[PDB]
Amino acid sequence: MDIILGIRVQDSVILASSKAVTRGISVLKDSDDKTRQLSPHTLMSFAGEAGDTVQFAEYIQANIQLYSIREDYELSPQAVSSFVRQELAKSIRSRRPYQVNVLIGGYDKKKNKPELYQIDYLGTKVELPYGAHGYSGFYTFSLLDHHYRPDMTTEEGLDLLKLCVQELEKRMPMDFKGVIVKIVDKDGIRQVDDF
């Protein structure tokens, strides 16, 4: 599984997600994109059990896209996060629960504010200035508790994020093969190609 991080700054939400897919003693892929665009201004990164992750992500994607076409309207990040939470809260008491942890980064166009939601497989939702899933938080949170300001720019956020990846690449046991970084703001979703 692995490193999914999220930082909400003044005007945007930044998601960083590891590129490795490891099975057994082999790294099968080093360019995996652990994210799905749910709507033009809403991105979801995911991590957990093999198969479950993509299956859940795409299922949520299909539902939000269906809603968009039906109402000719984009759901708010808060609304999408609540829908996702409920689906996971249902799942946890099913015969076979989805073992998937997600971060949802969105830009609310009605409020003109970035929003980051952390939701685990149990359906535990929180809104946070910065978030992480798995062992990643054990490293990066103290770093973010120190350096994070609520009025940071997107560039300042990316530098703050570089600091986190560097710490993880130093102290983490596994080679997670770097991260794919994506920014969510007023203009939508774009990928940083050189990280």
Partner: protein, 240 residues
């Protein structure tokens, strides 16, 4: 469960419930589809016995099934919502399993199949709806226009109309549409569509809706003034 076979054959070999569903379509407001060289235009009549309407919130006559395909109809409005919903769900399901949006032919084939199913299932009546389905296949620039009807038959059309007085507007399109040279631009296609509706409508005020679909999910609905300019221009050329 209610089981009654409502759609059945008569001695002469007709299924009257299917044929009466076509009469409901004939009562509905006129709808027209015209495809150009690089676009499809869907035009729709709106009856004017209803003043004091709120057009912001009133259900529009042309519905997006996906970002690249649209559906208009003639007949029972309530019935059409059920077909539109099912079509929208199948659109997302196709993207999920095939990893590619639906072709216009496929989406039409699905909608037509649903309609057919309601003609030989117990306890249900046929849909009192005929549809015009238009759009562009993924990564394709060839315009697509299809028509479905209550029986379940579907087919492709260079241009077609359905609803009340559709036989009058079909007559117009049959002599005004050249297969060898379809409307080369967006303007030409919208005009031929507006012209065809003006044979039947009344005033070109808040009675005509026009929606233009271009390749790669490029769909936009025209406003009153934009349509009114076509109405104004056509009438001045007519006085000759």
């Amino acid at each position: 469960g209610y089981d009654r076979a409502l759609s059945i054959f008569s001695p002469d070999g007709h299924i009257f419930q299917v044929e009466y569903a076509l009469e409901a379509v004939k009562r509905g407001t006129c709808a027209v589809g015209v495809k150009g060289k690089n676009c499809v235009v869907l035009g729709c009549e709106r009856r004017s016995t209803l003043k004091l309407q709120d057009t912001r919130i009133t259900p529009s006559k042309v519905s997006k099934i996906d970002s690249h395909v649209v559906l208009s109809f003639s007949g029972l409005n309530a019935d059409s919502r059920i077909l539109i919903e099912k079509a929208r769900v199948e659109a997302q399901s196709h993207r999920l399993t095939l990893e590619d949006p639906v072709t216009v032919e496929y989406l039409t084939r699905y909608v037509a199949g649903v309609q057919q199913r309601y003609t030989q299932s117990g306890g249900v009546r046929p849909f009192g709806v005929s549809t015009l389905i238009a759009g562009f296949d993924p990564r394709d620039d060839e315009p697509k226009l299809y028509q479905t009807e209550p029986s379940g038959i579907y087919s492709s059309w260079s241009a077609q109309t359905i609803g009340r007085n559709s036989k009058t507007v079909r007559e117009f399109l049959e002599k005004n549409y050249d297969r060898k040279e379809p409307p080369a631009t967006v303007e030409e296609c919208v005009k031929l569509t507006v012209r065809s509706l003006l044979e039947v409508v009344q005033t070109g005020a808040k009675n005509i809706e026009i929606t233009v679909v271009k390749p790669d999910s490029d769909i936009v609905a025209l406003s009153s003034e934009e349509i009114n300019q076509y109405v104004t221009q056509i009438e001045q050329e007519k006085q000759e």
